[PDB]
Design a protein around this ligand. Structure first.
Ligand code: WE6
Length: 132
């Protein structure tokens, strides 16, 4: 019953500061513009200890992982990162490390929304998803 409140299909309904977050991460102009237009669906499922998070839009990406166990991830902007995802007080905390840099993506349930907060140095972006 780990992560039950996260499981399902979620659709993006609002975004703030995502371009600036992508700039900070180092995403190039064309990818920022196309990514910024996307209205992804996020599909979260659990089977045993394995959590799967898919992002589907007009790129489709998927990660599967066990909490606390590092994995290699190729991100939507083609960074090759080492990722670890943990549950901290009900919040899924995803840390990505690459080339001496680090970014953290937090996913939390708030009312009927799933809120995704992305942070790189001083820059925070907030993305809000609702059930599909
Ligand atoms: O899951 C979320 O809400 C947030 C969590 C952080 C990533 N993220 C996205 O939505 N990333 C998305 S969605 C999408 C693209 C990217 C994309 N991210 C980045 C770098 C910032 C990582 N570069 O492209 C490009 C093409 C198709 C649609």
């Amino acid at each position: 019953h780990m992560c039950d409140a996260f499981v399902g299909t979620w659709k993006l309904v609002s975004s703030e500061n995502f371009d600036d977050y992508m700039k900070e991460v180092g995403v190039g102009f064309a990818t920022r513009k196309v990514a910024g237009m996307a209205k992804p669906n996020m599909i979260i499922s659990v089977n045993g200890d394995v959590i799967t998070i898919k992002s589907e839009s007009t790129k489709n990406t998927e990660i599967s992982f066990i909490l606390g166990q590092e994995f290699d991830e190729v991100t939507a902007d083609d960074r090759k990162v080492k990722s670890t995802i943990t549950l901290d007080g009900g919040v899924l905390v995803h840390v990505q490390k690459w080339d001496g840099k680090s970014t953290t993506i937090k996913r939390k349930r708030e009312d009927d929304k799933l809120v995704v907060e992305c942070v790189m140095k001083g820059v925070t972006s907030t993305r809000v998803y609702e059930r599909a």
